Amino acid sequence: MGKGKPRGLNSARKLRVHRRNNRWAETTYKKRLLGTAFKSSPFGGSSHAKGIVLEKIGIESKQPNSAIRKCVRVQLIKNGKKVTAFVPNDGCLNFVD
Amino acid sequence: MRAKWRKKRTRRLKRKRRKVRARSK
Amino acid sequence: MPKKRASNGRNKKGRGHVKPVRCVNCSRSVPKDKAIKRMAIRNIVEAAAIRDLSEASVYAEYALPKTYNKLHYCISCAIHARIVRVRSRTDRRIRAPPQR
Amino acid sequence: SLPSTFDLTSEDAQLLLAARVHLGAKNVQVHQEPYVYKARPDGVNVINVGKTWEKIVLAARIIAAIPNPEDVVAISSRTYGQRAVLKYAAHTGATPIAGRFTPGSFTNYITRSFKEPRLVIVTDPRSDAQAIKESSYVNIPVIALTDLDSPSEYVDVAIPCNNRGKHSIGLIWYLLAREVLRLRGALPDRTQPWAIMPDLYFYRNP
Amino acid sequence: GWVPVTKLGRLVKAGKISSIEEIFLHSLPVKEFQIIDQLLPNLKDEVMNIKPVQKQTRAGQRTRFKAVVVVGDSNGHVGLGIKTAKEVAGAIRAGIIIAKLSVIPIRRGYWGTNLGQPHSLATKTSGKCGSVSVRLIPAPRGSGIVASPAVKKLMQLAGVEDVYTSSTGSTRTLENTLKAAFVAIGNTYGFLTPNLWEVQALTPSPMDVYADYATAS
Amino acid sequence: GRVRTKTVKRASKALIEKYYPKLTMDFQTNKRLCDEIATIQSKRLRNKIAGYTTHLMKRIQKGPVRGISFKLQEEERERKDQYVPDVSALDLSHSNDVLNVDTQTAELVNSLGLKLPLSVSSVSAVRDR
Amino acid sequence: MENDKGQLVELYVPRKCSATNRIIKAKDHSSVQINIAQVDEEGRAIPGEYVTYALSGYIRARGEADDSLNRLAQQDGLLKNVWSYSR
Amino acid sequence: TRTSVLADALNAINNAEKTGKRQVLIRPSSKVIIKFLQVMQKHGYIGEFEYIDDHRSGKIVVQLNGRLNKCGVISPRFNVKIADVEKWTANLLPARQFGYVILTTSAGIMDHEEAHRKHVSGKILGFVY
Amino acid sequence: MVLVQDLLHPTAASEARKHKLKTLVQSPRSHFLDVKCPGCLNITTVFSHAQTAVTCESCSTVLCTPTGGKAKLSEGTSFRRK
RNA sequence: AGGGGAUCGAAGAUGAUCAGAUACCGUCGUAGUCUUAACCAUAAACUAUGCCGACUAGGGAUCGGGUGGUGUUUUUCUUAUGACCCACUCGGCACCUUACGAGAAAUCAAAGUCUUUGGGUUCUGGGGGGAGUAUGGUCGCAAGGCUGAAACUUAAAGGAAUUG
Ligand SMILES: [Mg+2]
Ligand SMILES: [Mg+2]
Ligand SMILES: [Mg+2]
Ligand SMILES: [Mg+2]
Ligand SMILES: [Mg+2]
Ligand SMILES: [Mg+2]
Ligand SMILES: [Mg+2]
Ligand SMILES: [Mg+2]
Ligand SMILES: [Mg+2]
Ligand SMILES: [Mg+2]
Ligand SMILES: [Zn+2]
Ligand SMILES: [Zn+2]
């Protein structure tokens, strides 16, 4: 077998164009090249986001386990988007208010 | 469901979609 | 599902897509290759005659011919009764004509 | 190197040729496998005789090369050799196996019929085969009496021969025993047809 | 509690095979176990992993235990036994016993320039078992074994001081990664060099020499 | 449904192995011979052993058998393998003429050998199979 | 192989197959030692003298062990008329 | 098409040596082949080899020694910048210790040790170990 | 044909057997058969694979009907080799 | 868009069955089927194996070419065609055994000559779904094709085999 890819000493371009245009099926590279982080992903492609507790929710979880999870719908400040944040530890949405 | 019909399903769904967007030129 | 067989449909090898034959029982179109083409060389008169016919007959020796139904069967149709007979993985390699 | 003595006596050739050792193998002809001097028309191959008997000596030379004689396990399954192997057993004291081999006899150190050869002899690598394929697991040579149809996989010192059977098997064993005795034993001379007898071996009336 | 079957068993009891090379020299089929303990005293004897492994039944299941045992030293011989027995201890026992039959020497080389005693591989070897290639890939001095924990412990018992690996394919299946790193080890005496170009005499084996002392009376 | 068990057949195989002599055809003798030698706890089992031993003896009269060939049965070949009914003549001599060898065989004889006896056949290769 | 000044390190310096020159390994359970007894004048097979021939497991399992052992013997003077140069 | 003859030749060698053939035939047979082989001869991976002249193209008979392991060819003849030899030979051959990288160059077709003494690099062809 | 063949010197049987192309040297196995027609006493160097309805030097006798391989020599004709 | 329509026969009617069943079966039976002039341009268009290139193993066969056999028979006397036998050969289509080679294995003499990684080239794939969807092209009479997303979603989806 020749093994698919070209092997010429002058190929290069048909490597370098191929690897541009396969990379695009690498989900790491796609998010970086298309700014999903910025254009979506509630937080602006950012570690964190201050956001005002709009309401303390109880979210009934998926299967195997069974528990209402004690969350908070938020309104992210900068974007004005609304998200749902978990509140870790015993009660502590009590501390959230 | 059977994949050929799941294909046929989304063929009608398109042909309904074509009438909807054509109703506003 | 891997290959059960190497042949599969069998005759068809080096031969695009051949013509088909309607089966006998089900009238199920099957390729004339996948077809299970048994030969039914049956007598025109059933064994439990035959005396009776030859007693009442004119002439001696007689034609006493045999009808030549070259059957076909849609594999499924064949399995349901006929020569097919579901063989073991190792036994499925054998092409030898059975009995005899 | 060699003595230039063993060139096959004119009688012993006539003995070999009497048993049709070289009017055998037939149409079917393996490609290893140069023990043909010409081929007779329609369903025949003609075996080169000189090549056989040089090896029948070579085999023996190897059989002799094992110091402990109660060790060379000859085997036979296909019936026409059974008796001949037991004759070879009698003259040259070397425990052998007639008929059924029992797998795990060179391997499997528990069996009642556990041997441990330091040489194996076989008549039909078509049939005894198992024992050959077994012997590979434990580092042993395999002297075999191959026709030009049989496979010689895991075989060293393949004596060319006719394995239609009947006469040729027993004859070729006897020529082995002969040259195994002549190469260290009682007999000091190549000459004298002596006794013994070829017909001591061979297949019998059941 | 000894009593050997097999010429070679008796032969080692007599003390005419010294230890151990001669066995390997003449690739002698060491089917008995005692032999390798007699000759090699320093066999340790480390259980890698023990999966439960179940056959399914008319009702319930059959928990066997595939205990994986690297046997070795730091001399240059290593073993690899896998054994599935229902009792676990017995499995490790039978695993150790099997590992001392499969025992196999390793061409330990340099690195580059001889200078002091060799404790890497000679060459880049590979194994291939299931879908694991172990490749390894001789180090320089003191760089260490660089390996999956499994491959490492095999390479501690070898006395390969330093080697790089490229354990490649599904190395998490340990039976295979070892079986791989065993074969890559086996490959060594098995790969030629120009330091073998020089032809040897082909010695007679102990079996051929000490015939009378072997076998029963 | 009288098929004798393994222990019955196992012992009786090992009994006739070690004691082909001390086993006279008939039962009651072989019965008393069994209780002498082998140490059976039961009565029925012992009687059933004796029952198979006899059936082994009665087969022994009509030739040998497989798995039952020990010392005396070995020797009861063996003579015949040693001193065979054959042979008169050689045999495999040049009794009738001087070997009907083929053209190819005659040519082979001439290459290796110098002067041997021959009777050149026509070598009719023949039609059909 | 040679440390400092000779001092041959690495034991098990292997049987290399006579046919191939390819190495016979420690666990080549398939390898072999054909030993062939030396001939003398008028009978006599000279007790305790062999022309040894190792075979690799490779050639042996293929079937090429047969003709390689001939050619081995033929070159080393245990045969005539057997192995030909051309075929 | 038949492109790199050298490779297409060395492939047959590598197949031959794998099975333990004592020789090989190589159809096309170039300068490069012969200077490549010549190199294998000077180190000793290869016996005699006998360049047939088809009144025509080429053809070679190599005698293998049971010494070749791999008769490598690297394919797009990469230009090598003297220091980069070390990275090729490191990545192709087993060990700093022994092996050769057959490279064409200004100097002709050396191996990578000869090319270091000379202080002259170039393109690569193949290797041997 | 297994392991050791010594491939420079084949047995001539093999050379004759193998394809006229697939040997050590590509040598063709055709000849220039010197045919004599019944008419004139003169000999035409007829290549055995002519591809043509081969006439004589002048007279239209027709010497060899070109078939696929070697040509069938028209009627009861006589020939020398090469 | 023409011609024809025998039978089957997407649609339909309709007769049974079943808790029911516009589903099999049952009976009929437009559209077609068939064809001609246009389009469409996809199929499990599947050898689910890109093309070229070389080289590795035997077995026997198998066929389309070609050689040699004082071979056999045809028999119109020698025949000469034909038709075999047998051996080997270029071209085609597939099996058996061991695999020492591959392979996750099933298996494969190619799916080998690959961690001992490089003969040449084209193409495609990067967890599953969402989706062959949304959009935009572009192509089509249309059906539809080609081209082709993410947001969102999820821990498996698979493959092969083992025992149940
Ligand atoms: Mg639930
Ligand atoms: Mg499935
Ligand atoms: Mg299925
Ligand atoms: Mg699928
Ligand atoms: Mg085709
Ligand atoms: Mg098709
Ligand atoms: Mg309907
Ligand atoms: Mg498609
Ligand atoms: Mg496809
Ligand atoms: Mg995806
Ligand atoms: Zn049907
Ligand atoms: Zn003229």
The DSSP code sequence of A26-90 is -HHHHHHHHTHHHHSSTTTSSS---EEEEEEE--B--SSS--B--EEEEEETTT--EEEEE--SS
Query: What CA–CA distances, in Å, run from E216 to E9, E36, F41?
Result: 11, 21, 36
- G-H C-beta contacts closer than 8 Å: 16
Q: How far apart are CA G29 and CA E30, in angstroms?
A: 10
G23 contacts in chain E (CB < 8 Å) = 189-192, 196
Calculate the CA dihedral of residues D198, D200, D203, D205 and round it to 10 degrees. Answer: 130
Q: How many CB atoms lie within 10 A of CB D123?
A: 28
Question: Mutate which of A9, A11, A13, A15 to test chain H, going by most H C-beta atoms within 10 A?
Answer: A9
Distance, CA of I1 to CA of I7 (rounded, Å):
9
Structural tokens at position G37: 């007894």
F79 — phi, psi (to 5°)?
-15, -55
Is A6 part of any known ligand binding site?
no
> For strand J, which nucleotides have at least one atom less than 7 Å from a protein CB?
43, 47-61, 65-67, 69, 71-73, 83-90, 92-108, 111-127, 131-135, 143-144, 149-152, 154-155, 159-164
Q: Is the CB of B10 under 7 A from strand J?
A: yes
Report helix, strand or coil for D206: coil
The residues, any chain, with a CB within 8 Å of residue D65's CB and separated by 6 or more, are: G35, G36, G37, G50
Q: Give the residues after which the backbone of chain H is interrupted, taking a C-to-next-N distance over 2.5 angstroms as a break.
A: none
User: CB under 8 Å to F44, separation ≥6 — which residues?
Assistant: none
Domain that holds residue F47: 1-61
CATH number of G1-87: 3.30.1230.20
Residues 6+ apart with CB under 8 A from F40: F34, F46, F49
Give the amino acid at C81: A
A89: left (phi over 0), alpha (psi -120 to 50) or beta: left
Comparing CA positions, the residue from E181, E171, E147, E164 lying closest to residue E79 is: E181
Question: DSSP letters of E189-202?
Answer: BTB--TTT-S----
Q: Provide the token pair at E191.
A: 């790969």
Query: What is the resolution of the experimental data for this entry, in Å?
Result: 3.6
Q: In chain G, where are the structural domains located?
A: 1-87
CA dihedral sign of residues D157, D162, D165, D167: negative
The answer for residues whose C-beta is within 8 angstroms of residue D48's C-beta and 6 or more apart is: D22, D34, D35, D36, D37, D160, F108
User: Among G12, G11, G20, G82, which residue's Cα sits nearest to residue G54?
Assistant: G20
Q: Is the CB of C17 under 7 A from strand J?
A: yes
H125 CB neighbour count, 10 Å cutoff: 25
* E69 CB neighbour count, 10 Å cutoff: 28
Among H13, H36, H42, residue whose Cα is nearest residue H123? H36
Please enumerate, as own/partner, the contacts of I45-51 that have beta carbons within 8 Å and a separation of 24 or more: I46/I71, I46/I73, I46/I79
Helix (H, G, I), strand (E, B) or coil at D158: strand
Please name the residue that has the structure tokens 């197949």: H15
Write the DSSP assignment of F66-121 as a string of letters. TTB--THHHHHHHHHHHS-S--SS-SSS--STT----HHHHHHHHHH-SS------
- What's the gap in Å between the CA of D46 and the closest CA on chain I? 17
G64 touches chain I (CB under 8 A): yes
E82 and E164 inside one domain: no
Task: Residue D187: count other Cβ atoms within 10 Å of its Cβ.
Answer: 17
Rounded to an integer, what distance in angstroms lies between the CA atom of residue D159 and that of residue D168? 12
CB-based contact, H65 to chain G, within 8 Å: yes
Query: How many domains does the structure of chain I reveal?
Result: 1
Q: CB D162: neighbour CB atoms within 10 A?
A: 26
D12-206: CATH topology is Rossmann fold (3.40.50)
Question: How many angstroms is C1' of J41 away from CA of E93?
Answer: 69
Q: To the nearest whole angstrom, how far is the Cα of G86 from the nearest Cα of chain E?
A: 27
Same domain, E118 and E151: yes
Question: Residue ranges of the domains in chain C?
Answer: 1-100
**Which structure tokens are listed for F11?**
């012992």
* Fold of the C1-100 domain: first zn-finger domain of poly(adp-ribose) polymerase-1 (3.30.1740)
Binding-site entries of E for Mg(2+): 80
Q: Beta-carbon neighbour count of residue B22 at 10 Å?
A: 8
Question: Tokens 């010497």 sit at which residue?
Answer: I63
8 Å CB contact of G43 and D183: yes
Is the alpha carbon torsion for F30, F34, F36, F41 positive or negative?
negative
Q: What is the CA D1 to C1' J87 distance in angstroms?
A: 38
Contact G22, G16 (CB under 8 A): yes
Question: What tokens appear for F22 in the block?
Answer: 């001390």
Helix or strand run (H / E) with residue I45: strand I43-47
The identity of residue D182, as a single letter, is: R
Residue E62 tokens, joined: 């059959």
Contact yes or no for D127/D78 (Cβ under 8 A)? yes
Q: Domain check: are E142 and E42 in the same one? A: no
Dist. CA D40 → ligand 8 center (Å)? 59
Q: For residue D97, what are the β-bridge partners?
A: D75
Nearest CB among G37, G41, G55 relative to D156 is that of: G55
CA proximity to G43, closest of B11, F30, D191, H52: D191
The ranges assigned to domains in chain D are 12-206
Cis peptide bond N-terminal to E137, omega within 30 = yes
Which sign does the torsion angle of CA H17, H23, H29, H34 carry? positive
In a domain, E125, yes or no: yes
- For residue E157, the Cα-to-chain-centroid distance in whole angstroms is 9
Radius of gyration of chain E (CA): 19
The domain limits of chain A are 2-97
H103 pairs with which residues across the strands?
H110
* Nearest ligand to residue A62 Cα: 1
Query: Do E124 and E179 share a domain, yes or no?
Result: yes
Q: Which domains does chain H have, with CATH numbers?
A: 1-68 (3.30.1370.30), 69-129 (3.30.1490.10)
Is residue B9's beta carbon less than 7 angstroms from any atom in nucleic acid strand J? Answer: no
State the pairing for strand pair H24-26/H60-64. Answer: antiparallel
**Would you state the torsion angle of the CA atoms of residues D59, D64, D67, D73, taken in this order, to the nearest 10 degrees?**
50
How is residue E6 written in tokens?
């097999």
Among candidate residues E122, E131, E108, the one with its CA nearest the CA of residue E179: E131
Q: ∠ CA F52-F56-F61 to the nearest 5 degrees?
A: 150
* Residue A94: both structure tokens together: 């009590």
DSSP letter, residue E205: P
Termini Cα distance of chain D: 46
Say how many C-beta atoms besides its own lie within 10 A of residue D27's C-beta.
10
- Burial (CB < 10 A; 0-12, 13-18, 19+), residue E60, is exposed
Adjacent-strand bridge partners of I64: I54, I73
Q: Which residue has the tokens 């490790």?
A: E92
Method: cryo-EM
Of the three residues E60, E76, E105, the one that is the final residue of a domain is E105
Last residue of a domain, one of E105, E128, E147: E105
Compare CB distances from I7 to H20, H23, H54 and report the shortest one's residue.
Answer: H23
Which residue, E97, E73, E91, E90, is CA-closest to E20?
E73
CA separation for the pair E165, E134 (Å, rounded): 7
CB D88 within 8 A of CB D60: no
CA of G62, C1' of J36: distance in angstroms: 65
**3-state SS, one letter per residue, for chain H:** CCCCHHHHHHHHHHHHHHHCCCCEEECCCCHHHHHHHHHHHHHCCEEEEEECCCCCCCCEEEEECCCCCCEEECCCCCECCCCHHHHHHHHHCCCCCCCEEEEEECCEEEECCHHHHHCCCEECCEEEC
**Torsion of Cα atoms, E40 then E46 then E47 then E48, to 10°:** -120
Through-space separation of residue C27 CA and nucleotide J15 C1' in angstroms: 23
CA angle B16, B17, B23 (to 5 degrees): 95
Domain end among E105, E126, E150: E105
């083929």: which residue's tokens? Answer: F102
* Spatial separation of the C-alpha atoms in residues F81 and F84, rounded to whole Å: 6
- The CB density around residue E105, as the number of other CB atoms within 10 Å, is 25
In what helix (H) or strand (E) does residue G69 lie, and over which residues does it extend? helix G65-76
- What residues contact H36, with CB distance under 8 A and at least 6 apart? H6, H10, H102, H109, H125, H126
Task: Give whole-number Cα distances, A14 to A2, A22, A33, F115, H4, in Å.
Answer: 15, 12, 21, 78, 21
Collapse the DSSP code of G70 into the 3-class scheme (helix H, G, I; strand E, B; otherwise coil) and give the result: helix
Question: What is residue B8's three-state secondary structure?
Answer: helix
Locus of tokens 């004592």 = H22
Find, among I30, I29, I59, the residue nearest to I44 by Cα.
Answer: I59
> Which amino acid makes up residue E126?
S
- Under 8 Å between Cβ of E3 and E193: no
> What's the angle, vertex CA D198, arms to CA D192 and CA D203, rounded to 5?
180
For chain F, what is the radius of gyration of the CA atoms? 28
Which residue range(s) make up the domain with E81? 1-105
| Phi, psi dihedral angles at H103 (to 5 degrees) | -125, 130
Q: Are G27 and G38 in contact (CB under 8 A)?
A: no
Spatial CB neighbours of E212, under 8 Å, sequence gap ≥ 6: D67, D68
Contact E76, E118 (CB under 8 A): no
Q: What are phi and psi of C62, to 5 degrees?
A: 80, 165
Distance A64 CA to ligand 1 centre (A): 8
A68, A58 Cβ separation under 8 angstroms: yes
What does the alpha-carbon distance between residue E13 and residue E28 come to, in Å, rounded to a whole number? Answer: 15
User: Residue A6 gets which letter from DSSP?
Assistant: -
Which residues in chain I have their CB less than 8 angstroms from residue H52's CB? 8, 24-25
Enumerate the H helices of chain E as residue ranges: 7-14, 22-25, 34-39, 88-102, 149-158, 174-186, 206-209
How crowded is the C-beta side of C70, counted as CA atoms within 13 Å? 5
Query: Cβ of residue C37 near strand J, that is under 7 Å?
Result: no
Which chains are adjacent to chain C, needing at least 3 Cβ pairs under 8 Å? none
